[PDB]
Amino acid sequence: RDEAGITGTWYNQLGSTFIVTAGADGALTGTYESAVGNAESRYVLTGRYDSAPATDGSGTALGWTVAWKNNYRNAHSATTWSGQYVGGAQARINTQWLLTSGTTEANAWASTLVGHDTFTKV
Amino acid sequence: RDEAGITGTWYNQLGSTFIVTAGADGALTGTYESAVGNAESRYVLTGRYDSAPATDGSGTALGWTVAWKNNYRNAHSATTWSGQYVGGAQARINTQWLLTSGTTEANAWASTLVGHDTFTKV
Amino acid sequence: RDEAGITGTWYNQLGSTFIVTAGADGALTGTYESAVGNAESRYVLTGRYDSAPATDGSGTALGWTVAWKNNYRNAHSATTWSGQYVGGAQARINTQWLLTSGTTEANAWASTLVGHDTFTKV
Amino acid sequence: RDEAGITGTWYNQLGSTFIVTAGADGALTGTYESAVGNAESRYVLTGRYDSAPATDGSGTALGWTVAWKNNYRNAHSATTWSGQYVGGAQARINTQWLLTSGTTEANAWASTLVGHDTFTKV
Chain A closest CA to B1's CA: distance in Å? 12
Per the CB < 8 Å rule, is C99 touching D78? no
What gap in Å lies between CA B59 and CA C61, rounded to an integer? Answer: 33
With CA atoms as reference, the chain C residue closest to B115 would be: C96
Q: Looking at the partner chain, which of C28, C51, C56 has a beta carbon nearest the beta carbon of D69?
A: C51
Q: How many CA atoms lie within 13 A of B100 on its CB side?
A: 35
Find residue D81's DSSP bridge partners: D64, D97
- Tell me: is residue B109 an annotated ligand-binding position: yes
- Between chain A and chain B, how many beta carbons pairs sit less than 8 Å apart? 202
| Domains of chain A (ranges, CATH numbers) | 1-122 (2.40.128.30)
Chain B closest CA to C63's CA: distance in Å? 16
**Chain C partners within 8 Å of B116 (Cβ):** 96, 116
Cα-flanking dihedrals φ and ψ of residue A105, to 5°? -65, -40
- B110 SS3 class: helix
**Could you tell me where the DSSP H helices lie in chain A?**
3-6
What gap in Å lies between CA A48 and CA A61, rounded to an integer? Answer: 9
CA distances from C67 to B48, B118, C38, D62 (A): 36, 29, 12, 7
Question: 3-state SS of chain C?
Answer: CCHHHHCEEEEECCCCEEEEEECCCCEEEEEEECCCCCCCCCEEEEEEECCCCCCCCCCEEEEEEEEEECCCCEEEEEEEEEEEEECCCCCEEEEEEEEEECCCHHHHHHCEEEEEEEEECC
Q: Which residues contact D31 (CB under 8 A, 6 or more apart)?
A: D18, D19, D42, D43, D44, D45
- Tell me: is residue B10 an annotated ligand-binding position: no
Q: Looking at the partner chain, which of B51, B62, B100 has a beta carbon nearest the beta carbon of A61?
A: B100
| DSSP for B15-46, written as a single string | S-EEEEEE-TTSEEEEEEE-SSSS--S-EEEE
> What Å resolution does this PDB entry report?
1.5
Choose the mutation target among B25, B71, B95, B98 for the interface with A, i.e. most A CBs under 10 Å.
B98
**Chain C partners within 8 Å of A36 (Cβ):** 106, 109-110
Element holding B62 (H helix, E strand)? strand B60-69
Experimentally, how was this structure solved?
X-ray
With CA atoms as reference, the chain C residue closest to B95 would be: C115
With CA atoms as reference, the chain C residue closest to A109 would be: C115
Question: 3-state SS of chain D?
Answer: CCHHHHCEEEEECCCCEEEEEECCCCEEEEEEECCCCCCCCCEEEEEEECCCCCCCCCCEEEEEEEEEECCCCEEEEEEEEEEEEECCCCCEEEEEEEEEECCCHHHHHHCEEEEEEEEECC
Q: Looking at the partner chain, which of C52, C61, C77 has a beta carbon nearest the beta carbon of D61?
A: C77
Report which DSSP code applies to A64. Answer: E
What gap in Å lies between CA B32 and CA A81, rounded to an integer? Answer: 18
In terms of phi and psi (left: phi > 0; alpha: psi -120 to 50; beta: otherwise), the region of B53 is beta
